[PDB]
Every structure is written in structure tokens, then in C-alpha cells.
Symmetry: D2
Subunit: 458 residues, 4 copies
């Protein structure tokens, strides 16, 4: 293989198979499926095999302890809570870190058994931050690039991590290190100067331009900001099949023809602000500011990481909110909140985007968020309204949505009422400006921006 991708997930998921969750699959699978090459990742279950399925995929077998301590543990109960501004208190555990080190080392060695000479390797995300340095040690001929799909925290918080130095050096084994936002890339150059003691650049980093540099002995490390997106054009087009439109109409009938339909779509994850949108909706019903008989909210929540107790805690609290709200304001035969805890099939989800008057995307912190960009591409009729949290990476590109600080609950409620009350002229004006950005900045633009930057490092 002249070209290898390394990520924890594969594009499939074993139960028989299934699509893997998350936006890294949403974006990489359409891109790489078009590109013959190799992919290394975990089959989503413990103690599988290492036999490939044919592009070419290589499964990494993880033991029961690898999953609990590197995946559920160091990755999702240390790195994840902390990188999103310690929403949940992180846990610092030495056995999780020791297992983190060892799994990353097995990934670096699976890449080597795949990476031909001089090949181009591309490593993905927070679970695999030591692989750049490990892989260079084994394999100094490779061109290595790394993209983090989650935010990179402020310096004062990253320094909590007992292994702050080994994570930084792990990332600097690559030739190019990328982030969604210039904010993440500037956090990084700071931490390189003020922890590993390297010479870094001092200007600010640009979007797909004005890249920074770190000087590591006899090597030079490039740093950049590359905001990911979706395969905008296929989705825009898939949303125009007569079947989807006719299905959107049937959805609103199955609900008893409300005047306004509000929607949320997310993995069930404490970053996502699902609890914020429910509380704001409940206080709006309480205040008589929405009509409880012709207005309804649907929440499509995908189960995620449910053996982590911070997720089961969140699940318990969100379920309580749904029975509470319906208990007070619904009628028999007529909830005001419809709550579903499973992954919807792609075509059924597109109908929901089309049926929805108001999209609710309220994360407390999010590296990017592709649900926001998917809704915008699905509305070639220019109806709808996107209520967008400013703590997402998308608010930097989607300025024409209605933008909220999710911690100001009055601002959330105010902005929900305005989106419900927008004029046709105002809603179409915004949906046009938002659609023009998303169609121009798709996943193609993002992938060619990163790998042309990586190619220059040679």
C-alpha cells in the first residue's frame, strides 16, 4: 500500500455488520471508498481476528482489557472529558495510560506491516496520538500526517494530564499536524514551545493557509487548520428524490399535522447539549410562549459508549426529562416530545431533516458538528431554520444560522421563538447563504487541502 489510513474505527461495525457511528465515518467513508488503498482499525468488538475483508481493511484485535482500559478508559474517560473543557471531571489512571501506550504501539506495527516504502500514512484522532512518533521510530521512510477531529483544550487545562509531555511528543512524530480550527493549532504551537522546548512560529495560523512550524532537531513539523465537512453534493441530491419528500409529508401526518416541528439528532453524549434544548423547550411550554397543541419536538439519540458511567448518568437524566415534559404538557395520544434511542437509517433521517421547521444543534463544545451541515444541504427548498451553538466549530462557517451561547438559557429560549417566527423572506435568505458555503466547502476541498500541505513537507 502506497497510502494508509489509521483510525480506531472501521467504516463497518459487527453485531453481521453495520455502519459505524460518528462523523469521522460520515466523512472518511465516502472519500476513501473512492480511493483504493488501506485502512487499519478496530472491528468494534473484543477478541476478533486479523483477517482482511476486501479497498482493503485490516482489523486490529483488541482484548477485553484493551477495550475497557484504552478505549472506554484512557480514550473516553480521560482524553475526551478533558479535551472538551472538562465538561465531566476526567480520571487519571496509570494502568489506562500503560494500556493506551501498548494499543497505540500495536496500531503503529499494523501500519508498518501495511505501509510500503516511502508510503503516505494518515493517522486520525485522539485515541491514536502516540502513533506518529512510534511509526517514525520503526519506519523513517514514511510521510506521516495527523488530524485531530476533536478540539484541543486551552493550555491551562491540558497541563492537568500527568502524561502531557508524552502526548505532545507523540504528535510531533508526524510531518503535518492538523486541526479543525486555528484555535486548536495555536494552542498546539504554544504547548510545543512551553513543554518540549522547541522553536515555533509566532504569527497566527490560517484556514487552509498561513501554516505554522515547529523545529524538532533535524526535522521541521508543519501545523494547520482544516475545517472538515460533508459530501455536500450527493446529500443535496439524495434529498430531492420524490420518495423522501413524500416521506417527510407522511412524517408530519403521523404526528397529527403540527404547525411547527423541531428536531435534534445526536449520539447520546454529554458534549451535545441535548439536556439544554429540552430544558429550554420545557420552560417555553411553561411560559405559554409556544403552543402545546400544534408544536412538537423529536429527538433522535444514538447510543454511544454506554459502559462509561458518565454516559449512563446522562442517559438517566435525559429520559427523566422526556417523561416529565410529556407528563405535564402532552395529552393521551399526543406527546409534545418524541424520544427515540436508536440509530435511524440514512433515508429515514433525511426525511426528518426535510420535515423539520427548526433544527436544534446546541453542544456545549464540539470540534465541528456535521449534523448542522447535513441539514443545510438537505434544504434545497430553502425552508427550515438552524439554531446553532457558538461553541461548535461550525458556527465559524455558518454565521447565518441563529447562533446561541448554550449556557445562557434565556438566549436559547429567545432564539428558539424567533426561528419559529421567522418570515419566509428571512429564512430563505439565511438558508441560501448557508447552502452556498456548505456546497463550496465539502469534504473534497478538506481532503485536498490537508494532503497537498502534507505533500509539501517532503
Amino acid at each position: 500500500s502506497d497510502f494508509v489510513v489509521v483510525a480506531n474505527r472501521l467504516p463497518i461495525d459487527l453485531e453481521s455488520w453495520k455502519r459505524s457511528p460518528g462523523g469521522l465515518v460520515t466523512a472518511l467513508e465516502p472519500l476513501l471508498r473512492r480511493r483504493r488503498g488501506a485502512w487499519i482499525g478496530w472491528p468494534g468488538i473484543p477478541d476478533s481476528d486479523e483477517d482482511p475483508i476486501v479497498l482493503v481493511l485490516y482489523p486490529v484485535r483488541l482484548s477485553a482489557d484493551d477495550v475497557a482500559q484504552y478505549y472506554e478508559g484512557f480514550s473516553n474517560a480521560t482524553l475526551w472529558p478533558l479535551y472538551h473543557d472538562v465538561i465531566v471531571k476526567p480520571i487519571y489512571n496509570r494502568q489506562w495510560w500503560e494500556r493506551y501506550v501498548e494499543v497505540n504501539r500495536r496500531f503503529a506495527e499494523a501500519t508498518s506491516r501495511a505501509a510500503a516504502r516511502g508510503a503516505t500514512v494518515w493517522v486520525q484522532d485522539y485515541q491514536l496520538q502516540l502513533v506518529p512518533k512510534m511509526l517514525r521510530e520503526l519506519r523513517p521512510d514514511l510521510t506521516i500526517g495527523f488530524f485531530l477531529h476533536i478540539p484541543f483544550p486551552p493550555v491551562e487545562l491540558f497541563m492537568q494530564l500527568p502524561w502531557r509531555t508524552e502526548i505532545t511528543d507523540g504528535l510531533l512524530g508526524a510531518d503535518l499536524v492538523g486541526f479543525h480550527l486555528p484555535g486548536g493549532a495555536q494552542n498546539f504551537l504554544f504547548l510545543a514551545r512551553r513543554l518540549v522546548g522547541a522553536n515555533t512560529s509566532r504569527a497566527s495560523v490560517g484556514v487552509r493557509s498561513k501554516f505554522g512550524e515547529v523545529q524538532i532537531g533535524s526535522r521541521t513539523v508543519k501545523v494547520g487548520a482544516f475545517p472538515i465537512s460533508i459530501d455536500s453534493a450527493d446529500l443535496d441530491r439524495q434529498a430531492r428524490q420524490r420518495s423522501i419528500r413524500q416521506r417527510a409529508r407522511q412524517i408530519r401526518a403521523e404526528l397529527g399535522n403540527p404547525r411547527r416541528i423541531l428536531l435534534g439528532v445526536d449520539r447520546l453524549d454529554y458534549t451535545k447539549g441535548i439536556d439544554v434544548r429540552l430544558q429550554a423547550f420545557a420552560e417555553l411550554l411553561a411560559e405559554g410562549r409556544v403552543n402545546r397543541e400544534d408544536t412538537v419536538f423529536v429527538q433522535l439519540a444514538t447510543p454511544s459508549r454506554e459502559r462509561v458511567e458518565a454516559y449512563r448518568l446522562l442517559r438517566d437524566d435525559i429520559e427523566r426529562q422526556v417523561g416529565h415534559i410529556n407528563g405535564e404538557y402532552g395529552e393521551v395520544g399526543h406527546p409534545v416530545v418524541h424520544y427515540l434511542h436508536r440509530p435511524v437509517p440514512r433515508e429515514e433521517l433525511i426525511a426528518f431533516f426535510v420535515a423539520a421547521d427548526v433544527m436544534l444543534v446546541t453542544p456545549l463544545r464540539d470540534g465541528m458538528n456535521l449534523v448542522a451541515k447535513e441539514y443545510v444541504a438537505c434544504r434545497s427548498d430553502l425552508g427550515g431554520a438552524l439554531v446553532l451553538s457558538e461553541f461548535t466549530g461550525a458556527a465559524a462557517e455558518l454565521g447565518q444560522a441563529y447562533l446561541v451561547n448554550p449556557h445562557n438559557l434565556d438566549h436559547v429560549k429567545d432564539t428558539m421563538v424567533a426561528a419559529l417566527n421567522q418570515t419566509p423572506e428571512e429564512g430563505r435568505r439565511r438558508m441560501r447563504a448557508l447552502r452556498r458555503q456548505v456546497l463550496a466547502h465539502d469534504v473534497d476541498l478538506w481532503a485536498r487541502s490537508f494532503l497537498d500541505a502534507l505533500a509539501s513537507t517532503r
Copy 2:
């Protein structure tokens, strides 16, 4: 007035909640000393008002009555709180009830005291006015004596009740509990035989007076509930209710106050497990729970409400579709005709309390099904199970058996359902609230 009823509150709120109100109201219609249901009330009256300060409500009503005695008499489902400041308020407020009873009573009058919040009234009243004839009926269970002895004030609770001429319970086993405490804790000479149902009553010597003790199981005004359930408006609304749920094959009903004695959590776990096991189709079966809010300034009541709402949102998320939940859950009282329409539409009635002195909801259902369909699933730990043996009786802690019993009731032959319904309604119609009042009062009058 020559006939005086004494109860915690009055028959309208500011209709009233509980099984005490949906019983004594139709009777009475054919003085009343009670609390408005509000703080610092006025004082004008025939009704007599008892004003409670903000602190009487918290320490006498919400504290002692509903966070000490209520959980204790119900087999300590929730840990009871023994608070001597609550006891002192309880005593005080009991005294205003006795005083205003005296201001309303005539020389030689009969008085009738109701339920667990006024247990000291009889003895206080008997001292103020030994010319009165006094009755007392407890509408909640009487706990076993190894648990009643926890009370720091167990001797004083028992002394108050003995200021009466007739002490009454729903059940014999409660009447006999009370005679044990009369013999051992107050040392009085008591009867030793078992007590019958409205017969074979017992007695306790207290000076030159004999206290009658007995068992009188409360009921509903059966025949009236039957005729109102036969009307076209009700039957048309029951057809329509089922259409608004998308025409289910099978409907199950829970109806109760949101209280930790009622087993709303049990019927939800059993129903979620059945859905998980494929033993009930999530497409044509549906459950409606109608929960009246209750005592939510008490924190054990909020803790219960949070986890039932958690249950509702969890079961719908796993088995429901958008536009079709499998559990509809309402947290408000329902107008009386609307409720009767749900008794008629309901194929299976789930009454699964962990402990209940007497459940009237299960007899209301019985009385509403003159078409002889439907099915009653009934906790043995209600006083009602002693009269309604032809229901589907369960121990609500035997969860496998609870789940088994709901399937059998959902899947009965109609001939079997009609046989059981025929037997239940013979009992309920022959033993209404009118049987129960004349029975108690023919015994209270017997002590002159």
C-alpha cells in the same frame, strides 16, 4: 349539630384528593371540621374551618403525618423520620381539631373522626366533652407491632385512639394488631378471640367504659357508578380514546396518586421486560398511566416521581416509534367522566400496590364494566384482594409471576373474563359504601 365528622381537610380544594374524599362525599350529601388545604385561612364556616400556619402544614401535615406515620404504617417502604418537633406540632394541631369539634357539637352528639392525622383527637375530645359519643376509623393499614414499636410516642398514639367508643379498620388483622397493643402496651383487659368482618367485634376496658373495636372494609357507591358508566357519551368517548391511540388491539390502564405505595414502578419494569422478551407486541399493545400529583413538598415523593419519569422516557425510547409511544404518561387529575371512559376502554387494569389499606380504584373498574369485559390484575397486599378473590392476584415482589399474570390477562378467553367479571361485580354491588356506613354506625350507636 347532632352529627359531626372530623377529617384533615374539607371536600373541596383551594373536589379533594384521596380515597377518603371519593367515598364520604356522596354519603354526606344524603358539621364538617377540616382544613381548607391552604395556609393561614379565614375562620368563617355546614362546614367548620381549621386554619394552619405555614409551620403547622410543614411540621404537622408534611412532616409527622406523611413522613413519619404514613411510611411506617405502610411497612416502612421509605425510612420514617422520628422528629420530636414534628410530634409537638402534631399534638398541638390535633388539639385545635378537638376544640373546634366541641364548638360545633351538641350535648350528646355523635362524632366521627377520620384517618391517621387525627389519632389524638378522640382522647382529647373525650376529656373536653365526656357527653359526646365518638367514633374513629383508620383508612390506611395498621402496621405489625414489631414495627409500630419503633415510634418514640407509641404509648400516646394508642392512648388517643382509646378515647373513642368504637375504633375501626378495613381488616380484621388490623383490628387484632390494635388489641395486642391494648393488652401489652396499655395493660388493659381485652378480648382474645379473632375479630370478624362487621361482626364478632372486640372490646377493651378503659375504666368504667368499654371500647368497641372492629373491621369495616370501605367501598364505593357501586350502583351509581354503574349507571353513569352506561351512558352514550361515556361509551362514545371510550371508542374515541382508543382511536386516538391508533386503534390498539390491547389497552392496559394504571390509575393512582403518585405515591410510593402504589407500585407504578413495578408495573413499568414488568412491562418493559415483557417488551424486551418479545412476549407482547410493541405495535398493537399500549399502556396508559394516569398519575395524580401528591405531596411533592415531601422529598421521598419527588425521588419517586423522578424515577418513574425516567422509566417512561426509557421504555418509549427503546420500543416506541415517532408518533406512537408504547407508554403514555399523564401527571394531572382527570375529570370524572373522562376517567370512567378510560375504565371502559381499558382491557387490563393494573393495580399493583406494595401496600394499600383498601384500594377503591379496583372496585371503580369492577363497577364500570357492565359489558362484563376487561380484566383486573391485583396486588394481594391490598385490603381489596380479600373481597375480590376472582381477580388475577399477584405478590408484587414476585416479578416473574407479575409478568406471567399480565400475559394471561391479555390473552384470556372472553368466557373466562366474563366469568371472573360476573363474580367480582356481584360482590362489589352487594357491598357498597352504604353497607359500610350503616355497619360501622350501627356499632358506634350500640355503646350508649
Copy 3:
């Protein structure tokens, strides 16, 4: 083939190297089976042990192997998270679990199979306590030639709560395979005869049952099951003499010196168990200090708590609330170098425990419920000087023999605090009167008297 075999879940030793096993079941029965020959079946305290027998000096033991899943679902599960909480008036909510019921069934069978191997033709078997209540019916089915006794060391709950158990019938059936069923008290005996007429439809004697006399009866076809009340005790005279040793009496003087010679010492000694009232006695102590009614400079409370069943979640929650109380009181009322509460979370050696009984001015025994409770009797036997004061919860079985203690309802905290103040301030004249009356009972009603009339009642069924 032994002509006399005792079977209990515990053995008198526990493998961690051997230590003495916990509980008052072991304190009463051990010194008795060194005297008499016989066999003892029990579980060695860990899983996946072997079956080879053990040399306890003269005593000889049969270990019962349990797998890890036997420990979790039978021991930790059904016994101690279903039976223990429910028999103690649902102080904690029992968990009703059919798989725990299934493995409680399987293990009772394992214990009955191991006794049958050991019992000779015609032997006497004495089965102990709540872990093993299906064993008698199982053993009578294997071995109709056997004389079966069963004793329940914990209380037997009122009928209204025992009915909550989905296996109420099968537990009552399993006790009725015995030739004699014994309890501490007549209350427990009278509940059982009520459940037998009510549940299994048997014909039952309906009169009161007396103390080691006035036995009840249960008709099982052609077999008749005797029922009685037998209040366990300790080795009263041997403890009294152990306490008279110089070495024990100077350790007592030295204990008080390392506490800075307080004027008053208060002591509690129990397994860390939520039936024990340790939270109660710490709450009362703290409020007496707050109110100024006990002197913080010359009074100190010592609590000796042995870890118990620490893998059951209710027991870890209890542990953490109590440890919270300890730090809270010492930080409010203690000085640096001088706490007002001393707490140790480990078993104490027996000669060290005796010296604490001797040094202690007030013994605090405040369970919310206890089938009997032997610490109250152990303290009394030690105070041959006639000093000391016993504060005893009336919900302990021992309160029916120890009426001259300072008796409290633990739920009446105001009264508990007043009774603690009066015990600390009693005249010498008044404490000797009570201590002298308490010791007259304990020395006359010892463990020999208890086992003698239980077993002679058993041998009266042949």
C-alpha cells in the same frame, strides 16, 4: 460416619494463613465442640478451596467448596442481600432475585450432600441459621434415618413482611423437615407456627410457647415437628476468670493511660453492620457534646468495628456514612493529639478485647434489631468488680434477660442521649446494684444451659 455433626455456612476458621472466623455464632459454638466429639461442615471463607479435611487440634472439619459464583449469588446475594435485610424488619430494601434463589437452592443441596456422607446411621445433625434453611428437608429426603435439629440465630420476621418473599412457601417447607426448630425467643417461635397454619395448611398448636419449655408442635403427615425458644448465651464462667488475670487488668490500666487518662471511657464493639446502631450512638454522642451536656476534655468514645460482607453495596454505604461521622465529631470537638472518638476498623485479639471491656465505664449496645447479641453478655461477665454500666437497645433479644440494664429505644434519640448522660453519672451504689443483678443472670444462663436443653429437646423426638 460420625454420630454427631453440626453444619453451618461458616467454619470456626477463615482463610485469608488462618484467622478466627467472625460472628457470635462462632463464639458460642466453638468452645463447645472442642469438648464433645463430632464433625462440622462449613465453608472455609474463600472460593475454589479443596475438599481435604483439617486438623483443628482435636476438632476436625469438613470444608465446603464454593465457586466464585456461589459466593456472589448464594452468600452475598440471597443470604445477605435478601434474607438478612428482610428478617431484620426491612432496615434495608431486600433484593428479590430468582437466579440468587436458584443458586441458594443448589448450595443448600451441596451442604446436605456433604452432611449425609459424614453422618452415621442414626446420627444426630444440628443445622445452623438462615443460610441453610432448605437443608433439613433435603437431608430428611436423603437420609430418613437421621435426627435433624435446626436453630435460627437471627430474628424471624412478622408475617406481614415474610410474605413479601416469592419463596416464602419453599423456605417454610425446608425448615419443617427437622425434628426440632429452635429460636432465641417465643415471639420468633410463635410467628413460625402462624406461617405453618396459614401457608402450608398444617395443624398447629395454638398456645403460647415458653422459654426452654412449653414447646409448640407442627403436624406433618405422620411426622411431628417440635418447636421451642432457646436464648443463646456465652461461656459465662470462663470469661469471668479470663478477666481476673493481672495481665488483663494492667492492659486495662495502660489502655486508659494511652488515652490520656480520661475520667470516662465509652465503648462499642460490633461487626460493621447496619443492624447495629453505631450511627445512632455516634449521633447521640455528637449532640451531647454540641449541647455541652458531656465534658469534651475528660470523656472519650472508642469504637471497635470488624469489617463484614464488604462486597455488598449496602455495607460499603454504611461504612462511608460512619467514617464521615468519625471525622466530623473529632474535627468539631477534638484537639490535636486528643480526639473525642477512637475508631478501629479491624478485628481485635481476644485478650485485648477483654481488657477493653474492663477499662470501659459505659458499654454502648444500640442495635436497631438483633436476634440476641452477645457483646452485652460478654461485657457483663467481665466486670467481676461490679463496675461499669450497660446501655442496651430493647430491640435486642438480650433485653428480655437483661432488664436491669439501661434500656433504650434507639429510634428515640432524645431518650438515648439522656440515658447516656445518666449512665456516665451513676452513683457507685447504683451501678453495682444493676451490675450485680445482670451478672446473676449471665452466670446462671450460659451457653452450656442453652445447648443442653435444645439438644435434650432434640433427643426427645426419638
Copy 4:
């Protein structure tokens, strides 16, 4: 008066008693020198009013003080250790109470006077007092950390707090980090022209109004002479004998606050004892903790957790008559505290986040003998001046433990060496050096 100080706190707390916290420990004697004026709150509801006290209702205490100040601002400014609460009623209170502080400042102020308002409870008063009295000079110093921008932007009232601060002529922080976090904000949030370069300590300021970094210290020489008293040295010995003459003493001293890391040192100590690496017979830990904000739920929950650790370690490794941890939940008198500083072989200073921490500086100034050792958390402002302490990251429990073993068994020579350099710093950079710096900038 021509110098008016405004803080939530007075120097006495109500019978008048010493006020808690390090803001007063430094500036109580520092300003007992030059006379002036001071606007504060007596620590008690409804007070009737040199010192000028502000009165608060029972609603203003709950919502402005227990609520917005210590349940919104304090958790957020300390790296969201606790989840902050964002309640608009608290915020409307906080506005109205700041208004009253500013108005008492206004009667107390004459024309041209100097004002110096103190701490996070009063960030709106610089703008309020300039609109009211444009003649005054106004300075402000923040005594807690100033949070990273990604966190501060959570605040629904982010723009108002930045504008209440920009009402002053000089804004001061302990560290250049807070000084530079605050310059970015003024650019980004309010849209002002700000300087770009690193701010240095007491120099190389920024501009929008002057922005500077001013590390607060203590009154270093007065504590040192107070620590050498024969009376203090005899009590230190009396204290060691009262514990059974241990071979080593460890000492923690702080308010009972979740920022202080008291739980971290209890856990490290419990594990060293389980591992056999500390001797349960000759080594003992003393923790002196002052109650703080105990009507606020997150503090009562901390309190419960820490008491449980104390009960758990003693029942595990203590013997009857001899705990391993003595824990005291009351403020100690000054003379007896200093005696504890002199007795202790190791000082445990493990905040998860602290704006400065003067307890470390206090211990350093007491040990004129050069004995002792100071284990200090790197997330204190002090760690920037006390680099020869034994520095730890308190989230690395394994390193905290290793460092407690090395400080407990240091050579006398190693110990004296670190302590001579520590005293060199603290003796030369004291409370008065700090004050002359800010006010020169302010007077500029």
C-alpha cells in the same frame, strides 16, 4: 477621604474577629500603616453602619454572595473544578449590590481621590463609580485566577463584566497569564485596541487603561521575628510531645475549599501507608481547615468527603490513643498557627488551582532555622516565585507520593539548601514591595 478601599470583606468579622482568607492577611498590616478609608461588608446580614461597612439583606447574601459570587464566578475562574450555575436572578442581585458598594465609595470619596476596589465580588463597580464620580482615580486587583478565554465565554454576562472592569484606570493580577488572557478578551469581546506583547512582572505593561501583573506577598519580616519567639519555639516542642513525639510531622493549613486539594494529600498519604512506604508508628499528618461558605452545597459535599477520608485512614492505620491523621475544623489563633509552622517537617500545599497561596510563603518565613520542607502545587501563583520548593502536579498522584517520600527523608543539607533560597525570595518580595508597584502604575 482620598484613599478608599472597597472589598466585600472587612478586616473584622462579626464581637469583631479576624477575617478569613489571604486578601486580608497581606493588606491588613499593609494599610494599618497609612490611614485612609475602607468600604466593606461586616460578614453579617443587616448592619446599621477608619472603616465603612456595607449592609446586605438576607436576599443579597444568598443570591449575590452565596449565589453569583461563590457559585458562579469562583468555580468558573478556577478552571471549572465545580460546574458553575448560571442564574439570571443571582446576576440581577449582583448588579444591584455592586451599585450600593459604589455609592458608599462615593460619599467616602472626596474630589480627585484614589480608589482601590478588591476581588471578584465587585467587578462592576469600576465602571459604575466613574460614571458617578468621573474625578476619581480607580484601581482594581483580582485575587483569584483569571480564566482561559474558552472558559470565560461561558458566562452569559461576559460583556458586562469586562465593561465593569474597564471602568478603572489600572487592572492588576498576580500573574502575566491573567494579564494576557484579559487583553485578548478586551480586543475580542468589547472591540478595543489592545497591546500584543507578553506582559512582564511589575513591568512591560499592556494598554487598552493600564494592565499589569503584581504578585502579592505577605509581611515577610514581621512573621519571621514573630516566629523566633521563645514562646513559639516552646509550644512547637509542646506540640510534638502532645502527639507522642513523632519522627516526622506533615501539616496542611487552608480553608475548606475544593480548590485547595486537601483530598489529594489525604489520598496520597493513605496509599503510602497501604504500600508500606511511610511508617505508621512515627509519622503523623495534621490538617487544620477553617470552615468556608458552608451554606453553599458544593462545600458541604466536599466537607462530607474529606471527613470520610479522615475516618477511613485512622480506622485503617491508627491505633487506639494514636491516630495517623488529626483533623481540626476551626480557625486557629495566629500565635498557635506559627507554632505549627515551626513544628512541621513537611508543609503540604496541593491546590488544584490557586491564584497565589500565602500559606506557603508563611511557612517559608517562619523557618528561620532553615529546617522543614515545602511540597507545593504547580497550579499556584506562588510556584512562579518558589521554584526551589518540591513541586508537584497534583493530578499525578504517583508523583505526589514519590515527592512526599523524598521530602520526608531529605538530607538536612538538601533541606537547608532549598529553604535558604526560598527565604531569599520571600524576604525580598513582601507585601509592601507589591503595593508600591501597583500604585506607582496607578499613580502614573
